[PDB]
Write an enzyme that holds these catalytic residues in place. Sequence first.
Site, PDB file in Angstrom:
ATOM      1  N   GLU A   1      18.293  15.992 -15.148  1.00  0.00           N
ATOM      2  CA  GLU A   1      19.348  16.880 -15.609  1.00  0.00           C
ATOM      3  C   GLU A   1      20.150  17.476 -14.457  1.00  0.00           C
ATOM      4  O   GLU A   1      21.357  17.707 -14.594  1.00  0.00           O
ATOM      5  CB  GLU A   1      18.752  18.001 -16.463  1.00  0.00           C
ATOM      6  CG  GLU A   1      19.675  19.208 -16.668  1.00  0.00           C
ATOM      7  CD  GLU A   1      18.999  20.307 -17.478  1.00  0.00           C
ATOM      8  OE1 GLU A   1      18.106  20.983 -16.933  1.00  0.00           O
ATOM      9  OE2 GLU A   1      19.348  20.497 -18.657  1.00  0.00           O
TER      10      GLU A   1
ATOM     11  N   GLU B   1      11.033  21.311 -17.816  1.00  0.00           N
ATOM     12  CA  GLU B   1      11.552  21.047 -16.479  1.00  0.00           C
ATOM     13  C   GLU B   1      10.670  21.724 -15.442  1.00  0.00           C
ATOM     14  O   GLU B   1      10.346  22.904 -15.586  1.00  0.00           O
ATOM     15  CB  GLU B   1      12.994  21.569 -16.363  1.00  0.00           C
ATOM     16  CG  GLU B   1      13.588  21.499 -14.958  1.00  0.00           C
ATOM     17  CD  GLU B   1      14.998  22.061 -14.900  1.00  0.00           C
ATOM     18  OE1 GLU B   1      15.376  22.823 -15.817  1.00  0.00           O
ATOM     19  OE2 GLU B   1      15.722  21.759 -13.934  1.00  0.00           O
TER      20      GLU B   1
HETATM   21  C1  5AD Z   1      18.720  24.254 -10.807  1.00  0.00           C
HETATM   22  C2  5AD Z   1      19.461  22.971 -10.429  1.00  0.00           C
HETATM   23  O1  5AD Z   1      20.549  22.733 -11.339  1.00  0.00           O
HETATM   24  C3  5AD Z   1      21.714  22.347 -10.615  1.00  0.00           C
HETATM   25  N1  5AD Z   1      22.695  23.440 -10.791  1.00  0.00           N
HETATM   26  C4  5AD Z   1      22.375  24.687 -11.199  1.00  0.00           C
HETATM   27  N2  5AD Z   1      23.480  25.460 -11.289  1.00  0.00           N
HETATM   28  C5  5AD Z   1      24.539  24.702 -10.937  1.00  0.00           C
HETATM   29  C6  5AD Z   1      25.999  24.909 -10.806  1.00  0.00           C
HETATM   30  N3  5AD Z   1      26.581  26.104 -11.108  1.00  0.00           N
HETATM   31  N4  5AD Z   1      26.737  23.853 -10.399  1.00  0.00           N
HETATM   32  C7  5AD Z   1      26.190  22.651 -10.124  1.00  0.00           C
HETATM   33  N5  5AD Z   1      24.873  22.394 -10.207  1.00  0.00           N
HETATM   34  C8  5AD Z   1      24.012  23.366 -10.604  1.00  0.00           C
HETATM   35  C9  5AD Z   1      21.334  22.155  -9.167  1.00  0.00           C
HETATM   36  O2  5AD Z   1      21.040  20.768  -8.955  1.00  0.00           O
HETATM   37  C10 5AD Z   1      20.085  22.986  -9.033  1.00  0.00           C
HETATM   38  O3  5AD Z   1      19.229  22.408  -8.045  1.00  0.00           O
HETATM   39 CA    CA Z   2      17.403  23.255 -16.884  1.00  0.00          CA
END
Ligand code: 5AD
Ligand code: CA
Lengths: 182, 178, 551, 551, 136, 136
Positions: free
Chosen positions: C221, C170
């Site tokens: 993702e 990624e």
């Molecule tokens: C690193 C990427 O992963 C997603 N992401 C990361 N952590 C969370 C969370 N707790 N909730 C929702 N989306 C998240 C977001 O889209 C961010 O941009």
């Molecule tokens: Ca990831």
Amino acid sequence: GPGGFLTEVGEARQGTQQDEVIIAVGPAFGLAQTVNIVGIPHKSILREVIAGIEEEGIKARVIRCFKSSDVAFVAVEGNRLSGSGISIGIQSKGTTVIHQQGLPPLSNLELFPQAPLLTLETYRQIGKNAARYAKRESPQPVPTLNDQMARPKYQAKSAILHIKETKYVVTGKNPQELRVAL
Amino acid sequence: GFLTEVGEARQGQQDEVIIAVGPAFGLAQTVNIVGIPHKSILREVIAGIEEEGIKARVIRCFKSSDVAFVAVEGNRLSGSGISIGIQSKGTTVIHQQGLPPLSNLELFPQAPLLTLETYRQIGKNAARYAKRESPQPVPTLNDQMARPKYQAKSAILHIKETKYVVTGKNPQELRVAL
Amino acid sequence: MRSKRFEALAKRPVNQDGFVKEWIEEGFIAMESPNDPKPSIKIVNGAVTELDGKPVSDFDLIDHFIARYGINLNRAEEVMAMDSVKLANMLCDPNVKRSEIVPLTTAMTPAKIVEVVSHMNVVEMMMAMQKMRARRTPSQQAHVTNVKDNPVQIAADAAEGAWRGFDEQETTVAVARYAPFNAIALLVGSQVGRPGVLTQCSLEEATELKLGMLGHTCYAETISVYGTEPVFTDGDDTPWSKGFLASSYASRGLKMRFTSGSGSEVQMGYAEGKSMLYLEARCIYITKAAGVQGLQNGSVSCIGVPSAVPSGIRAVLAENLICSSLDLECASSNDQTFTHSDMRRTARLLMQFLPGTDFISSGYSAVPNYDNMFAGSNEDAEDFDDYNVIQRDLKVDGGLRPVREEDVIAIRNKAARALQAVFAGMGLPPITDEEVEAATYAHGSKDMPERNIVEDIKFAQEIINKNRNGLEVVKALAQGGFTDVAQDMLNIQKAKLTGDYLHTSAIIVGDGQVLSAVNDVNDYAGPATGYRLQGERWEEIKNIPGALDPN
Amino acid sequence: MRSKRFEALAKRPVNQDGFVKEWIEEGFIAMESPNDPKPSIKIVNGAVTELDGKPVSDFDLIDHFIARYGINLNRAEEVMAMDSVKLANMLCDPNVKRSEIVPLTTAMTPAKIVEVVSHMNVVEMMMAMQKMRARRTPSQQAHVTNVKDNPVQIAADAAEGAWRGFDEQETTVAVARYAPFNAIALLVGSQVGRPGVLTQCSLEEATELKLGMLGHTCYAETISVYGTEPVFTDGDDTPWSKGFLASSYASRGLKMRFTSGSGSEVQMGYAEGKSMLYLEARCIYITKAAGVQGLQNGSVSCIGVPSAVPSGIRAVLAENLICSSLDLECASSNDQTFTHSDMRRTARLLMQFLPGTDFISSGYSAVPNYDNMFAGSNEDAEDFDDYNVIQRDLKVDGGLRPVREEDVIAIRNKAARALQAVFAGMGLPPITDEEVEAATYAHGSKDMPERNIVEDIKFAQEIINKNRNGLEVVKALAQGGFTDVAQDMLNIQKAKLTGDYLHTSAIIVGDGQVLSAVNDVNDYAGPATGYRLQGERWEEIKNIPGALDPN
Amino acid sequence: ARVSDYPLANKHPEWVKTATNKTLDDFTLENVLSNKVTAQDMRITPETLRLQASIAKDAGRDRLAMNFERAAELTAVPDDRILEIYNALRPYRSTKEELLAIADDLESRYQAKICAAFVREAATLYVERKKLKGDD
Amino acid sequence: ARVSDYPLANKHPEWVKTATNKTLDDFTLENVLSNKVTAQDMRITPETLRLQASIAKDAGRDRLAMNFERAAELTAVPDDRILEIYNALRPYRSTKEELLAIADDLESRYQAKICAAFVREAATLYVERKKLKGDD
Ligand SMILES: C[C@H]1O[C@@H](n2cnc3c(N)ncnc32)[C@H](O)[C@@H]1O
Ligand SMILES: [Ca+2]
Ligand code: B12
Ligand code: B12
Ligand SMILES: C[C@H]1O[C@@H](n2cnc3c(N)ncnc32)[C@H](O)[C@@H]1O
Ligand SMILES: [Ca+2]
Ligand SMILES: [Cl-]
Ligand SMILES: [Cl-]
Ligand SMILES: [Cl-]
Ligand SMILES: [Cl-]
Ligand SMILES: [Cl-]
Ligand SMILES: [Cl-]
Ligand SMILES: [K+]
Ligand SMILES: [K+]
Ligand SMILES: [K+]
Ligand SMILES: [K+]
């Protein structure tokens, strides 16, 4: 065997006068191995232990032990024969103990249980203190050396060296007095 | 008390950059997450814009406490299409009309790392974007312990900022004290 | 007078971490909150009239989506009546099959399944996770980034990470305009290191889908969902826009999962008084309801929020367990910094590493953390040798392998040269021989020459504006002396035509072999069953650098 | 030309650890060795004639002792007939009671139970350990030592350790002649910190028994057994001498356990070509055969041997599980350094910490490791805050608690003043007021004034030679103004009269209340059953330093 | 199709055609270089997505199969229109009438009946939950 | 006695006496200070150890009970003699005759029949396994 400097000159006899300390070395000392676990030569170790004993006005006698490669039992065989009852046991990998006749085998007067930390200065002090015990002093113990990473760095190597040391054990063979080529 | 409202913000004229601040900026909170005064922050961003011969126009936004939507409403009102969004806790974005709300030209997503020198440079770059130049992006600041040190504090400051959101209320133009 | 004991402790890195006392009213509580609703469901004429205490008249968009799409209503009243302690017992009992549990969990409500797992300690959760994990073989995912968005370095680091065993990798961007370069570099480097590694570039949602449409990524993702309606709104989506987005990716043949994770709603300011775990359970059911095959969760980027409060790291394991128990692929985080303490971050990783998940980490940093553009991962490139040693210590397959310096040098060099050929062929700003050499031997961007970033991002955006697609990269490789890489790149694009890797947990191993939960189904039934580290894979893990032959 | 990536990794602490490739011929293999015997048992006229392939004519002293005393022959045919995979399943199955398993496991041969646990991964082993642990409540044991054998510092550190939650505490000697002072200092400090903490002083066997007979210890643990006859012999014992010694301790009302641990036979030169785990099973059965209630194992002091080889840390957990499965108290190590890496030593600790054992650590160093006279522990005093944080993160009871600096200063000062009064009252070499203040605020011996070691060991050995007993210490405390401490010391001596704390897993908690496996039987039956961290104990673990009020 | 028929690439490569009736074997470096195949040819079909949905049902994943069925309809919709509809469903972008027009377009132009109902359902709920243009 | 009789100090304190027939409530601080009780008084009895053996059996721990039965016999042996016998059983310390004399003495002086049998058992095996004096 390369680096030879110890000649067996017959079965060690018990000393009759208080004037001596016995250095008892294990069955592989100066033979299969010629340095300790961190590369200090057995020749230098023995030279410094002898020098420490003799500079205290006490005679140094060196024997090799065969019935066990355990350094406590090597030292016990030495304290049986020492006229002062004081002995120093030294394993090939460098582990050292000052022992005294009458103590349990796995007891001692002073113990040096982390061979990688011993320096030539320490070995000289081990000989000095052993001689001072022979003179019935209560010497300031050699300062404690303790390194919490010694076992992480060296325990596996210590076990491998000791396994090799144990191949030189001879059941029933009494200690041999050594002529030291120093 | 260095920010005063001077009425509903209007569409920009083309030689301007809008600085859009969140609803608690300079009010319920007066420093960012590492204690840099909001008055100093705005002073440096404005000075950076003006150093490039571009006008700075400051507005407060109310419909969201999220810095992207703060900046988005600023870029729609900006006569250049260029806006800078700043939250009370310090998070900053350079935005451009026509980009999705959660996109941007430049993003400063670790507020603890910004200095007053960074803030001045952000204003400078935004003014250069307003002039249709292609400035070197402000160099990336990244500290892997910033979240371990400050994320809980960032969440708590944002919870507090969020209490000043007002549904349906259009941005207000601000006068900045001398 | 200070106790020198406490002076020593005050200097310890763990005491730089952020801890807070529980704050119920704003949701700063990890799990087991008094504000959390009691499980319930009412159904009238085949439609839900009440969900976990809430009447259908008060439903927000999340309730509507879950109640209409996320719960098997034919068995929901039956499963609601079941004892939650017995259900938790069934979860960790090695003799209750995974296929006996999934029909129960898919009929639970969000609060119901939370009540079930909240009866469990972390040992019981791990015991359950090794059974409920969808794919029998565990895998691993890496971050490949740097603070300059340097494409030569990305390609080399990606080749190394592929060579070390990551099956997904990624990237993301410091400067958003750089993205097409980051994505292409990630894809080319990944295929050089091991053909079949899947690649993604994490962006704003519309931007990321357009980049995937042009063929410069293999999957997506970071398709985020959230557990309260105002937070979802500031995330610029609804359950319906994200559900449509999910089917859009699939309609282009692109694998995708959602991302959620405990503490996002607190971080974004509207927890609606609920614990992190309950709100995360809503996110997991949103994912199930949308028909999305998998989920990245375990707090992810918000890990500083649950880690601040009691039982937060246990809650993180619990939310991974809920994900797998609902028959979703679980990319289980371990990808984001939350602590200054090596002891503490290791304890957090082991919750997923020991049982195994579909991706034990969903973003192990394959670069040193100063270069990690997700603001640091729970593990980074300087931990590679520790990670291999712990696999060997515990006889646990954590998805990675020891590697030889000369092999990594060779693979990074080929990756940099291949990207240099892509840039030359596509008329992109040149990658010099000096840059190739630097990337070969680099540890991170500190070791890389400066590029003209202004020029790079002009040309990168031209890739989007002129719709330059993935076949241009294939052609540039084939005409630039890299027909081997060109073929591997074409094979990756051909995976988007079959739909195979759209299924739960799918990766591409070996000679283009799709490996998913469909054909690699977890069949755990206690000791000496299910996945076991053994054979050549065990020999690989045993062979760490430094092991002396004691002969 | 070097890869800077590999130059960075080469400098990592983990690459200072000792690793070795398996060496089967000398037993340098943790478990599952080709040379290990297959399980078998033949019984004629109610006596064993063959044990694990070996005819009685080939028995060494260990075989004879195990065959005659160590195996429950009443269920031996049934359990030998059972499939070892099914038996491994029963161990981790939450719904097979501990009480149903113990009659069968205690009937297994050493090779049989090794075969059973070797079917398990570490998650399954932990799932089993939380059930097989004899005492329902987990506990913790600490080291209290320093490189000077300074008695004032021992008393202060012991008081602090008792205050932090350790229920047993252990000292030993740099200079053997110091032992009576170390023992008295530990006992006085422990009773100051929490009355009922049990104390031991690890020495050569005859010396330690004599010291116990004089009343200056409460129990003994380092009563060592070994898994091959030549190694046992260099250990200066036989199974019969150690069994006699065990009964000698009990005949004086003193609690004791044996100690063993994987890798001792390799370290001492005679593994007889067997794996570490198989030889350690022999040690566990020697302990069972002797009628000893408990065992310290988990490699313990030889941890550098299994950790060097593949699956060594897994084998360490396996040997703990065998111990508890044989219905022995398990003091499960986590007491000895094996790695330079914080990540690696945390992985090794969590195997026992997560499920709980009778003593999660059998020697957490309550001093900084530079002062640890067992050559360093897997955790030390600078880890106290990390340990507490992980307890709170995972909702796991690790036996310790956060504590206030002002409380620790006061309790350390009281202990130092009490020992000062003991030394004055017994005519020992004086403890000055300067030493009392130094010990109060010390981190370790670097912070202590130098003592006259020659004079100390003179008087220390006079305690042995004149048989100065524990009631002298009681009297000196009483005469010096410490009536309360004197009463608590007297109460520890009274526990040696009832035999209650001789039983499996016994500690003394609260107001002199024995807590053992007999009246605190582990009753684990899955989620929401058995020991759970909750109530006031959970409130205690949550209350770490640095947890801020958010609003 | 059953779990035993999966993966298609490894078991039944000939089951896979593209929107322009090309096979997998047509995608070689030579055909890419000569432009005998182009990006327009490299797109999954509804038939392939419905075969994968059958596999998902046999694997017990009904909601995944439903996603694949929606995706199968959306293959007929061009990339730029996909992006427009996704945008329209984001908060405060659309009026109710615009969402209902998108649904009618999906149904009457592309026969995307399931996706059209999905969008109509969003429209009704965006009124109630105030996510339409002007609601912020 | 059974596990319901445990702990003795709580359920049945009067089942516990010392080697000099003192009780638990005799050991007060003031009695220690005035030498009314001394260390010789503070020693566990064979009666207490046999009760604890019975509790061990009831807890399913027959080998622990056997250890307590050996310990009950050894209460009668003075401290110095315990140490002498322990040391005599260590490797290479004793002849076979010295061990058999220890056993006969254990019986004649202390009626320690189980411990004597234990020593004789060791002596027999020490011949076969060469752990007697002079076997090293
Ligand atoms: C690193 C990427 O992963 C997603 N992401 C990361 N952590 C969370 C969370 N707790 N909730 C929702 N989306 C998240 C977001 O889209 C961010 O941009
Ligand atoms: Ca990831
Ligand atoms: C590992 C260790 C052991 C191991 C290995 C012993 C062996 N012979 O191989 C085991 C657990 C089996 C053990 C047993 C004993 N040990 Co030890 N042991 C240690 C420990 C924790 C670490 C040493 C180490 O790893 N050093 C690093 C390596 C690389 O250096 P090394 O020189 O090769 O180390 C060797 C020596 O330490 C030697 N050794 C270990 N213990 C003892 C004890 C004596 C009396 C002697 C002479 C040698 C010896 O064994 C090591 C490997 O060969 C030390 C703690 C410390 N402060 O050092 C205690 C320590 C040295 N042991 C001690 C004791 C009391 C014993 C026993 C007498 C206990 C008993 N119940 O009988 C026995 C002696 C058995 C024997 N034949 O040696 C005390 C000594 C106190 C003193 N001042 O005399 C120490 C300080 C602490 C303790 N209580 O454990 N020990
Ligand atoms: C935590 C984090 C999030 C969190 C919280 C966001 C929030 N609004 O609260 C979550 C997981 C929800 C998230 C989502 C997104 N994020 Co984000 N995020 C991070 C991360 C990993 C760490 C930031 C941090 O903890 N800083 C330390 C604290 C103490 O400082 P802070 O100033 O208070 O931090 C705030 C900002 O970082 C802000 N923020 C976080 N992400 C984004 C994205 C945008 C466009 C904006 C304007 C602000 C913003 O939220 C933080 C808390 O308020 C960074 C990586 C990095 N390099 O910094 C990415 C990062 C900033 N996020 C990014 C992206 C792309 C997004 C999304 C657009 C992805 C999506 N699928 O929609 C969304 C935007 C949602 C939103 N409304 O802001 C990109 C930005 C790329 C670029 N150059 O424009 C980054 C660099 C990497 C990534 N792919 O995750 N993010
Ligand atoms: C620390 C003390 O514990 C005992 N000890 C420690 N480790 C082991 C082991 N692997 N085997 C046997 N005894 C051990 C020894 O008695 C040592 O001196
Ligand atoms: Ca211990
Ligand atoms: Cl709290
Ligand atoms: Cl629990
Ligand atoms: Cl190996
Ligand atoms: Cl296994
Ligand atoms: Cl489903
Ligand atoms: Cl038994
Ligand atoms: K995204
Ligand atoms: K969430
Ligand atoms: K001992
Ligand atoms: K052992």
